[PDB]
């Protein structure tokens, strides 16, 4: 009947905490120096240990998750670390005089301009092809002298040609004393109590696929397709969608471009586009209309579960923002594509003929809302073609005072973090507090 | 019977108290200026810092070598009124830590003062002869 406190060291007790995670990737061997894997990420253990926690029920919140905020700052910081040593194209802001590529009734333009040479006193005139988006006319009156789009706002640096932009699986690990809780509930929505929970030291192979509008190469939701949002009632917050069946999308750049290596200084090398060899075709992606119409129908079924079992569900193209947010932007073999998705979100729902999408390309880009530094993607030699998985989406309501009679859904890409949340919805970081004090009928011996 | 790290987190406190070794093991174990290197090194220093703090508390409570140690501090009923069967056969360490997280700091202070600071002086005066 006399109770005394006793210290237990190693009690399964944890508390919500945010710590500094680190990198971990398999032992992939090779060209290399891919930005994300870096020179050294801790190689994944030959065998990971996933330990299911019986009887455990933990509250999750993918929208207040700090793993997202950390990953975001890691991608940004990794990008800058790879641009620092590469060649900066400060002298490439010389006035450009551009002409058309002949044809009657032009996305790319043939530009001639003078560029410095190895020797300070000598100069050289070189001709290189450019895309319309990367250039603006220096007159508007108009004459026809053009300049690079970035020279007015921020400097520019050329991405090194060796580093590759292909995402590889990356595992986010937590330090000793902390742990990661994975929600294995198939039907798990955005937030809430997860009945089935397990613990792991590192996450699964998460590929840092930077996309917009459409989610590519992600992980497929099990069982039914999932509709995740922070506030379905609030139109302002985006809507994450995860497919149970992946749709296939083929993007190609049929032009047989060429790489022109023009030295612009001692050691500095600039890689310009070389006249195209062969026909002049524009890049485009294909999607099977049967699968997409089927996949889009499965989405509207889960959509009605939150907007009434019967309601008008239409789809329109992006009507807000410009440039990145209006086009399904992404990377493919080193070239940055920008596709018009009006053909995919152009339906209305109530109660082998593959779709084609126009894609334009740029070589000067400012990703992640970066203000101050632009990057020049060196031209990729040969024909480019990449087959990717479209696993998720990012939608948004139009809002307004419509009496709930009809609901409209448009794509968007407001923030880059939503891409990370599409793969970090199931994980959570907690710290282990192994000191527990409890009363027992034991007493220390006075001896 | 081993379930793995934190396997008994949903079990009763009595069942979890049997596998404290499991949590004890996995509790500690040209330019290197990469973003990963700075994160890793800072993560490693954070892990040993937390481990040494808990081992520090066990040291000042005279319980360094053991996972289960008994003390001289009596259980003040204001902390919890639950009987032994209700505590050890009806509650998990999680919901227990939540019920007593309020008085943990007070309990830790009594745990370092009441015994091991009194015990060591009395141990010298006892083995003094």
């Amino acid at each position, epitope marked *: 009947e006399n109770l005394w406190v006793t210290v237990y060291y190693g009690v399964p007790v944890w508390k919500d905490a945010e710590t500094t995670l680190f990198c971990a990737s398999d032992a992939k061997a090779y060209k290399k120096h891919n930005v994300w894997a870096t020179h050294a990420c801790v190689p994944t253990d030959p065998n990971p240990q996933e330990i299911h926690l019986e*009887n455990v*029920t933990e*509250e999750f919140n993918m929208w207040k998750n700090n793993m997202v905020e950390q990953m975001h700052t890691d991608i940004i910081s990794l990008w800058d670390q790879s641009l620092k040593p590469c060649v900066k194209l400060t002298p490439l802001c010389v006035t450009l005089q551009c002409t058309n590529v002949a044809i009657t009734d032009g996305e790319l333009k043939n530009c001639s301009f003078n560029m410095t040479t190895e020797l300070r006193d000598k100069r050289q005139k070189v001709h290189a092809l450019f895309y319309k988006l990367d250039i603006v006319p220096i007159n508007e009156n108009q004459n026809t002298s053009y300049r690079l789009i970035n020279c007015n706002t921020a400097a520019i640096t050329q991405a090194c040609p060796k580093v590759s932009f292909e995402p590889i699986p990356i595992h986010y690990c937590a330090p000793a004393g902390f742990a990661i809780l994975k929600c294995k509930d198939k039907k798990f929505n955005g937030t809430g*109590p*997860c*009945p089935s929970v397990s613990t792991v030291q590192c996450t699964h192979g998460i590929k840092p696929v930077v996309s917009t509008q459409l989610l590519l190469n992600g992980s497929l939701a099990e069982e039914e397709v999932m509709i995740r949002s922070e506030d379905i009632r609030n139109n302002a917050k985006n809507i994450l969608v995860q497919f149970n069946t992946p749709v296939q999308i083929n993007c190609t750049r049929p032009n047989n471009n060429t790489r022109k290596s023009i030295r612009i200084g001692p050691g500095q090398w600039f890689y310009a586009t070389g006249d195209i060899i062969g026909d002049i075709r524009q890049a485009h992606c294909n999607v099977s209309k049967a699968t997409w119409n089927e996949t889009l129908g499965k989405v509207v079924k889960q959509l009605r579960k939150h907007f009434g079992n019967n309601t008008i569900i239409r789809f329109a193209n992006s009507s807000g923002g410009d440039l990145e947010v209006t086009t399904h932007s992404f990377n493919c073999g080193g070239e940055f594509f920008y596709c018009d998705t009006s053909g995919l979100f152009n339906s209305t729902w109530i109660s082998n003929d593959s779709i084609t999408l126009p894609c334009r390309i740029k070589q000067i880009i400012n990703m992640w809302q970066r203000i101050g530094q632009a990057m020049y993607a060196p031209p990729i030699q040969g024909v480019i073609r990449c087959v990717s998985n479209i696993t998720g989406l990012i939608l948004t309501r139009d809002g307004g005072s419509t009496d709930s009679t009809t609901e409209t859904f448009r794509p968007s890409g407001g923030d880059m973090r939503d891409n990370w949340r599409s793969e970090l919805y199931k994980y959570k970081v907690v710290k282990i507090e192994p000191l527990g004090v409890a009363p027992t009928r034991c007493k220390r011996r006075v001896v | 019977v081993f379930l793995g790290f934190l396997g008994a987190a949903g079990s009763t406190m009595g069942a979890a108290s049997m596998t404290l070794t499991v949590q004890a093991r996995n509790l500690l174990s040209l330019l290197k200026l990469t973003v990963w290197g700075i994160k890793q090194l800072q993560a490693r220093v954070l892990a040993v810092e937390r481990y040494l703090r808990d081992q520090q508390l066990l040291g000042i409570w005279g319980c360094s070598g053991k996972l289960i140690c008994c003390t001289n501090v009596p259980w003040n009923s204001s902390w919890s009124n639950r009987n032994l069967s*209700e505590i050890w*056969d*009806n509650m998990t360490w*999680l919901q227990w830590d939540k019920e007593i997280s309020n008085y943990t700091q007070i309990i830790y202070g009594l745990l370092e003062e009441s015994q091991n600071q009194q015990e060591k002086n009395e141990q010298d005066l006892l083995a003094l002869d």
Partner: nanobody
Amino acid sequence: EGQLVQSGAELKKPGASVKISCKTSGYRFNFYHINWIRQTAGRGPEWMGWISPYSGDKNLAPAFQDRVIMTTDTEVPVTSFTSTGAAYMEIRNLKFDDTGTYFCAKGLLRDGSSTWLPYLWGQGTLLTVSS
């Protein structure tokens, strides 16, 4: 600190079957046995059986082993430590002496020498068997 709410009273003719429900809240439904006990004027209080929401193991008294079917639904989580659930008992071949009051009851402890012991009881369901 949870409440068990049973279905309303029912009148059934002898020979028919009836299914009583017992909805729970305020605690982890998965962690405690659900017992079923009845009280009639002829036999007094009589324990019928219990069932485990976690494993599904059931133990029926021999007097009801051939006429009682106990089932449970899966818990709907509310918080990390509480959830809502539902248990059912289907009794068939009703007789006049089966008229009485039926109770569902939550077990006492998750572990020990008396885990299933009915501790938290519902408000009771009145069953009348008559032609």
